[PDB]
Design a protein around this ligand. Structure first.
Ligand SMILES: O=C(c1cc(O)c(O)c([N+](=O)[O-])c1)c1ccccc1F
Ligand SMILES: O=C(c1cc(O)c(O)c([N+](=O)[O-])c1)c1ccccc1F
Lengths: 116, 115, 116, 115
């Protein structure tokens, strides 16, 4: 509930389905620790990545594997991935939606942050 | 010099070339009067639309013929066109760039206003 | 159900609430007939604009009143509104989400079109 | 000439000036090695990062220090930075512009790749 990822396809006008997403958290030693991962559903959404207990304060990286998505639709794309890096929960728990809108040579990303 | 339009293609990663662009000025009766038009260049840009003398304060609409652009590339698009409607304000900086980034089902637009 | 509008605020990282939206449909005589209107909710969404019976084939214009939104947050913005113009339902009924992401000097819009 | 970065501000409608930009090249061991860096100019652009000789095929990362930019304007932003990661490909056009459009809680990036 506290972290959701939504991915849209600007070419098709559709959810981006089956997009791999890997989340990392920065460790004490400044490495990126694997935190959670999953795939977008037929709605373009990925729920169930973490829990409010697990999703502590930290610096998180949400890596959206855009290059496999375009390639398996016959578009050799430009980017390797889209990386979204942010501090979370540093004023207490929040709910985060990380959205991405994909094109072969472009993407946009936004965050919607709500206080439960 | 006061108004430039720039159009980019997010599918090909390129300028959007030969895109028709029409600029209108809102009239006193609230209708849109033709003001300037042209086709984007090889660089995706359209310069020479107006002059400082002619580009007075008011409400302008820039209509970008995105549907024809996509059609000519053999791609089916969503929008009829992209319209950008704004007020020219003499208190702000003097040069306006209206940029548009096109995808078949999406577009982005921004204004870069400088002195 | 067949037409939904969602508006997000890129400055706040939040839904854009209380945004006025006016929908028009192009008439036979090429004028823009008022079709429906409403305001975004606290989720940034506007539902209930039309019905599948009413939402016939045509050219529709969704006008999102971005300039009142920025102004009532102390930002004099650049655009008068964001206009989204599209042909709908010309291959039978579809469900349309028109999304807009707003900044004071920029916006993006996308469509998600699904076949029920 | 082969690589330019352009950064724009969607809140002010302006170039994003004095933004730190770091470019890295992916090494054989999968670590990121510093490649080029600079600060955007008054036009929001950063030219002179590399030369045709040095800019060989490979995976590059462009990291744009968006957090410091927003902080210096007294605005609280969401992201730590914006990272753009791509492969340089000799089969495609020769000149790469990496553009970024910044808002506090959002950014857009596109590549304009030309000959
Ligand atoms: O359009 C976007 C967006 C975001 C959402 O959270 C969302 O629910 C929907 N939507 O349903 O279409 C759309 C968007 C996503 C990423 C970056 C820029 C964007 F404009
Ligand atoms: O990417 C954009 C943009 C703008 C410019 O003015 C420009 O010179 C370049 N560029 O050279 O790539 C790119 C852009 C355009 C419109 C809306 C959102 C955007 F991100």
């Amino acid at each position: 509930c506290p972290l959701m990822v939504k991915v849209l396809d600007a070419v098709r006008g559709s959810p981006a389905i089956n997009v791999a997403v890997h989340v990392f958290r920065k460790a004490a030693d400044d490495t990126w620790e694997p935190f959670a991962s999953g795939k977008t559903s037929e709605s373009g959404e990925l729920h169930g990545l973490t829990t409010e207990e697990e999703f502590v304060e930290g610096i998180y990286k949400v890596e959206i594997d855009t290059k496999s998505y375009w390639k398996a639709l016959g578009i050799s794309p430009f980017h390797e991935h889209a990386e979204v890096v942010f501090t979370a929960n540093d004023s207490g728990p929040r709910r985060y939606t990380i959205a991405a809108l994909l094109s072969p040579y472009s993407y946009s990303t936004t965050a919607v942050v709500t206080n439960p």
